[PDB]
């Protein structure tokens with residue numbers, strides 16, 4: 046299905062992998078899942094080039110082939126010329142949800158209306174993966190990309206897995222479920238991580254911050270339950286269109302996702318249903 050590249054092609058499309066900022070004159074859009082991503086070109090389509098480990102390259106293509114959905118990023122191609130490896134996708138013009146929440150490079154803050162659509166879209170993408178018996182294992186705002194219409198697209202299926210335990214604990218610790226940190230592999234851990242994403246959407250705060258109390262965003266749930274704070278205290282001030290009702294409705298979903306006991310968390314279908322009722 047995917048078009049097979051050759052390293053020279055990609056070297057050139059990326060202006061010899063100009064690994065520097067776009068502001069200056071480079072091509073580096075960013076770095077992430079065991080790699081770097083630069084803006085590239087294929088005739089009419091702008092591509093994202095993921096220059097990289099081998100087993101994470103092999104799995105990404107495996108998962109991408111069976112999992113095509115409007116809320117999953119689309120893989121167009123790749124190149125496997127030696128130890129230098131490359132993955133190629135439809136370029137997401139509005140980058141990651143993490144970067145848009147932080148207004149990286151001066152992009153305007155996302156409105157509450159836009160935030161609600163992104164949360165629903167991301168929940169729909171997770172639903173598709175769970176329906177297809179796949180556990181993402183690295184649900185985070187850096188892995189939620191935004192297209193030309195700010196439609197949420199789940200990315201990075203390198204750690205994805207098709208109850209079961211592991212010796213190699215992998216993921217982003219600020220987003221990980223307690224049982225995932227203990228080696229358990231369960232789709233219930235993806236729900237917990239999605240709860241952290243929902244808190245990031247409401248607050249616009251990063252999942253972890255050394256210079257903050259609490260350092261971990263997931264801990265604001267406790268502050269609220271203990272009444273040391275309100276959700277209203279944490280609503281992102283960079284919005285003019287949030288209303289208490291839908292904000293509290295999204296917080297309620299986030300709160301349920303963040304249950305310490307995995308079996309007490311809602312499944313993705315209940316999450317999707319609850320986010321749809323919110324609007």
Ligand SMILES: Cn1cc(Nc2nc(NC3(C)CC3)c3nc(CC#N)ccc3n2)cn1
Nearest residue numbers: 074075076082093095134136137138140141
């Ligand atoms: C403004 N801006 C647009 C972009 N576009 C973009 N960014 C991707 N990753 C980021 C966020 C690290 C750079 C990306 N990633 C994949 C999948 C992978 N790897 C597929 C498409 C992508 N498109 C980035 N900043």
